[PDB]
Amino acid sequence: ATVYLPPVPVSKVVSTDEYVARTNIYYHAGTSRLLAVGHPYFPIKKPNNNKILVPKVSGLQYRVFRIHLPDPNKFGFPDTSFYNPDTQRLVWACVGVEVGRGQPLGVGISGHPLLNKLDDTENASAYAANAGVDNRECISMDYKQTQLCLIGCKPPIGEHWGKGSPCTQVAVQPGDCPPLELINTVIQDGDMVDTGFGAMDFTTLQANKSEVPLDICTSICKYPDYIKMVSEPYGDSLFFYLRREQMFVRHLFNRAGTVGENVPDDLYIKGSGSTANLASSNYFPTPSGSMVTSDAQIFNKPYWLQRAQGHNNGICWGNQLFVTVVDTTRSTNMSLCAAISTSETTYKNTNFKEYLRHGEEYDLQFIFQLCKITLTADVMTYIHSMNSTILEDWNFGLQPPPGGTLEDTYRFVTSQAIACQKHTPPAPKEDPLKKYTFWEVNLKEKFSADLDQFPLGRKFLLQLGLKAKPKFTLGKRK
Amino acid sequence: ATVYLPPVPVSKVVSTDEYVARTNIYYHAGTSRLLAVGHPYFPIKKPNNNKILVPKVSGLQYRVFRIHLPDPNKFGFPDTSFYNPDTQRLVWACVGVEVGRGQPLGVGISGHPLLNKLDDTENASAYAANAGVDNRECISMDYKQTQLCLIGCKPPIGEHWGKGSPCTQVAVQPGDCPPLELINTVIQDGDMVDTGFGAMDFTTLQANKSEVPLDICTSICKYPDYIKMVSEPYGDSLFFYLRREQMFVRHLFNRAGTVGENVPDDLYIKGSGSTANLASSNYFPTPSGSMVTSDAQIFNKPYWLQRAQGHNNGICWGNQLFVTVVDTTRSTNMSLCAAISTSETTYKNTNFKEYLRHGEEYDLQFIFQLCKITLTADVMTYIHSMNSTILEDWNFGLQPPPGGTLEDTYRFVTSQAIACQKHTPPAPKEDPLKKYTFWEVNLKEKFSADLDQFPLGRKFLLQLGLKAKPKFTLGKRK
Amino acid sequence: ITLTADVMTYIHSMNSTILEDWNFGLQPPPGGTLEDTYRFVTSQAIACQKHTP
Amino acid sequence: PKVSGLQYRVFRIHLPDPNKFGFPDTSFYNPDTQRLVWACVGVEVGRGQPLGV
Numbered sequence A, B: 001a002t003v004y005l006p007p008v009p010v011s012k013v014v015s016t017d018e019y020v021a022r023t024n025i026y027y028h029a030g031t032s033r034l035l036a037v038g039h040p041y042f043p044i045k046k047p048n049n050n051k052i053l054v055p056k057v058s059g060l061q062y063r064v065f066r067i068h069l070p071d072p073n074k075f076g077f078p079d080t081s082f083y084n085p086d087t088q089r090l091v092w093a094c095v096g097v098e099v100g101r102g103q104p105l106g107v108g109i110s111g112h113p114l115l116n117k118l119d120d121t122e123n124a125s126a127y128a129a130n131a132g133v134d135n136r137e138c139i140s141m142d143y144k145q146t147q148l149c150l151i152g153c154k155p156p157i158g159e160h161w162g163k164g165s166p167c168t169q170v171a172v173q174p175g176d177c178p179p180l181e182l183i184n185t186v187i188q189d190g191d192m193v194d195t196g197f198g199a200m201d202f203t204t205l206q207a208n209k210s211e212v213p214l215d216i217c218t219s220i221c222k223y224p225d226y227i228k229m230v231s232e233p234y235g236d237s238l239f240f241y242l243r244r245e246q247m248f249v250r251h252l253f254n255r256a257g258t259v260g261e262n263v264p265d266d267l268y269i270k271g272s273g274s275t276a277n278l279a280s281s282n283y284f285p286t287p288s289g290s291m292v293t294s295d296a297q298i299f300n301k302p303y304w305l306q307r308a309q310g311h312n313n314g315i316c317w318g319n320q321l322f323v324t325v326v327d328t329t330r331s332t333n334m335s336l337c338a339a340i341s342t343s344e345t346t347y348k349n350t351n352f353k354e355y356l357r358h359g360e361e362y363d364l365q366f367i368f369q370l371c372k373i374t375l376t377a378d379v380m381t382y383i384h385s386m387n388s389t390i391l392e393d394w395n396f397g398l399q400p401p402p403g404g405t406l407e408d409t410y411r412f413v414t415s416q417a418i419a420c421q422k423h424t425p426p427a428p429k430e431d432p433l434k435k436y437t438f439w440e441v442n443l444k445e446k447f448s449a450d451l452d453q454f455p456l457g458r459k460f461l462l463q464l465g466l467k468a469k470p471k472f473t474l475g476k477r478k
Numbered sequence C: 001i002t003l004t005a006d007v008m009t010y011i012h013s014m015n016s017t018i019l020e021d022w023n024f025g026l027q028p029p030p031g032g033t034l035e036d037t038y039r040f041v042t043s044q045a046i047a048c049q050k051h052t053p
Numbered sequence D: 001p002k003v004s005g006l007q008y009r010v011f012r013i014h015l016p017d018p019n020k021f022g023f024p025d026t027s028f029y030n031p032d033t034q035r036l037v038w039a040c041v042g043v044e045v046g047r048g049q050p051l052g053v
Helices: A377-387 A389-394 A455-465 B226-230 B377-386 B389-394 B455-464 C005-014 C017-022
Strands: A022-030 A034-038 A052-054 A063-068 A088-100 A110-115 A137-141 A145-152 A157-159 A161-163 A180-182 A221-224 A243-246 A248-254 A283-288 A302-304 A320-327 A333-339 A352-374 B020-030 B034-038 B052-054 B063-068 B088-100 B110-116 B136-141 B145-152 B157-163 B180-186 B221-224 B240-246 B248-254 B283-288 B320-326 B333-339 B352-374 B439-442
Touching (some): A022 A455, A063 A352, A088 A455, A352 A455, A377 A389, B020 B455, B034 B439, B063 B352, B088 B145, B088 B320, B088 B455, B136 B283, B157 B226, B352 B455, B377 B389, C005 C017
Parallel strands (some): B063 B439
Antiparallel strands (some): A022 A352, A034 A352, A063 A320, A088 A352, A145 A243, A145 A320, A161 A180, A333 A352, B063 B320, B088 B352, B110 B136, B145 B240, B145 B320, B157 B180, B248 B283
């Protein structure tokens, strides 16, 4: 520049598929399986202390991993360089991923010993059974079936309705629901999916703090904010998503507690008896999970990334991948027991102490394409306007210093002081993370160049070149 | 190449129209004839509130009008093959202003019921000397003739005298009347023009606060500073101005109060009577107009622009115009009364409630030529040293993937009645060319291709000489 | 929209009102006729006269 | 207010005058022998709400 920052773009934003050439050099990577054994309901901590002994792990929460990748320009190379390192720079493209489940078919489960529930109002049994002191019951559910996986390279955006706070312009008091304002935030590991009360916080909306389970009270519940993400052309925040979700209405119920609502008292006619009074108009549909089937598994089959939502196809502008997984369908909870004493020789429920765990597996197989971004002066100006940090990291002119001189604290040694001594010694240092809240997967040298002996690999050779297998695949008929 | 780019230099100083290419597309616009009906002296307010019922409006007061124009590029036309934004932008040029006037002949009335006044200077009816009896008579006068107009496109500066550095004793005294130092500041609507008591404050300046009429008593008097604006080197502040002005002395009068002023006793012989008593030097001229006729106007006459006085040609930079008009030749005040109960035909105040008004009419009729600015980097960068803002509005470049919008933006209210709240909407804004209130003239919805429907454009046609357009014909009348 | 005099004859027969709203023909008449004097408020500005109610 | 998806949500959408509208190169146009009109060539409607009846 000038002209001008550039032009044009904006408008029309140049794709990274017009000057970023693919190469036929392939490396292969994968993980060694991942296993995390939690307690979905709550983490089990030592209550004499504050540290976890069993974490919280669940498929009914987002499992969001921050994958850090090498860069090809760190290599000594096996000789993948035939040109000057300043006419081009190298970046990865990920062209296939399979995300495996090692968990059997069967659901996980959540619940609450005191879920806020009055009476049954699907078909009556009461108007109220209580409006004084207590009325909550032992009730469990498995939250709705959600399967989705989505892949990006910058952090995903979630939406949820946060607490818009009661206003005093229009009459809303405590004991009236607030106006609700949508407060959107990044999807991060440990966070709960939508429950079908809407996707909202429950940490400060809830004030009994015991309407719902131990798990969702203490999370933010979120719905994916597809909408802002698919409107970024580049799609660096995601360049792949899919979903399958469903839920059915188990039974209508009424919440524990009295109306806070204002009912116009002129939309009915008064009765006599039971029909004189009103129940609480705080009806809620009770939701419940769906039937699990092996034809609903979007997993253990490969998601290609040869093409992507974004201009991005896994192109490294940080050398990171974000992979978010939800699987509620193999999120088996396995039940077990240990006997408290062998002093009790009869069957007692004060003898054999039931315990639940959830075991969580994930494996990710990857095929990596080596790609290049060819740099001319004009290209370099576009990137500079785009994100300057990329140029510096690559290393590219024009840098000051010099620099110099003197220094201080001279001779001796100490020696007393003299001399100097100021002293004064440097670097706190401080501070931004940039962690933020993710299950760290380091890949740096799991990279390969054979892909005939990885299962994903074999299928990728089949798809790409129509060879090699190596001998044969399938049937026939069968 | 190039690379960079001098401005091209600010010290090469040029017409602001050496790079603005006129085109022959012409549109017309004007007003409906705006009206303001005040009370000449002050505003007649509710005395429970500060809210006006009757504003304060005269022709002896500034009429500052803020003409607003769209950017032409943003304005649609039905045929548009004269602009491409990949090559050019557009900007208005006003090439004719007609000041419609339509009011009777008459002049504003100003007065003070406690105007300081003792004797006649014009006569020797009574003495001007020491007097501990302070006379205050009800006197009224019309103020001087002021007719002027300025048409500009940036805010215009009038000068006045303020109270500058102070004295070391109390102010407005013998020998400790403070230094009065010139404060130039932007012209305000409905603040006073020059009145023949000069251009200065009176609230803090005049500590008697009772010697001069009410309309200028609480208010500043200011005169437009011509010298400064024509000594600006782009002449955007103004670029056309004209005046016709005069004072007439109604009579010199002398104020009451004792003599503080020194009378040397080496300039007159001693005797008795007069030659031993001090004399007042407390004279004030009384301002009045000399003659007023509606053929003594400078108004009602078309002003054809084609190369402004300034380094402008009459270009609407920012697509605004700042018109400050004074007219006193017409500035009639009309008196009315309301009878509540006639019960004697001879005046009573339990009958006839006297009222005073002043009604003020102005119409502004316009013909605007469209002109273009080519997008050349040397011109752009030079414009950037002059003012970057026109450029930023046009907008160039990234927006890395894209920030601000899209993103995708925005959420989401769209108010109901709950709504989402809390709100407290975002703040009030001030326009960058607005510091003081003006009489706003929006023009953004009235543009006509044809100029034959309006007498100002026909007159422009005939003067233009396309195609070729009579001109005149005789008679007229006769 | 391609339009000629014959085609227009038909356009009005279907919906009078469409041509009349577009009014790139026609006429309803342009206007004209007066704009003035003067409405509303009346008065403005300064004024706030009466308010006017 | 009673606003829900269980009662008809009828939106009046009012669109630019196409006839006089911002364009980049037009000089064919004759008001008498041609007119312009918008035709909308797609709509998507985002329902940003989660499941829940």
